[PDB]
Design a protein around this nucleic acid. Structure first.
Length: 97
DNA sequence: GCTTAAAATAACAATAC
DNA sequence: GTATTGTTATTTTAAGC
């Protein structure tokens, strides 16, 4: 059902798409599932997968189980670094792996 | 044809409520 | 006690030499 793809890319865009300086792991899961149905169909653990490609890359700060996460109500905050490491490049989705 | 790197995936673990 | 997130580590895939 279609091959896999770079999540970091979708992530970088998920964060970039939000220049408001804010993001939510859950929100992303929705933004992705909303974008890709197949992904929301199989969802072979897009939790760690996303969160992985989400954190493992940008290297930002997130908020764990807070007093305002009834189900999937969390908050993720990223510093002005992701857009920095990106702007520098030119949307390289590999970088001579 | 082989190895190396990075990307992608999965499982657990820790905190918080 | 339960629920949500976070962190780590392992795996797999694909491209680099």
């Amino acid at each position: 059902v279609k091959p896999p793809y770079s999540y970091i890319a979708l992530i970088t865009m998920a964060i970039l798409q939000s220049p408001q300086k804010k993001l939510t792991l859950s929100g992303i899961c929705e933004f992705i599932s909303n974008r890709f149905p197949y992904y929301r169909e199989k969802f072979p653990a897009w939790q760690n997968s996303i969160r992985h490609n989400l954190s493992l890359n940008d290297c930002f700060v997130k908020i764990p189980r807070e007093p305002g996460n009834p189900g999937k109500g969390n908050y993720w905050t990223l510093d002005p670094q992701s857009e920095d490491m990106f702007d520098n490049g030119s949307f390289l989705r590999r970088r001579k792996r």
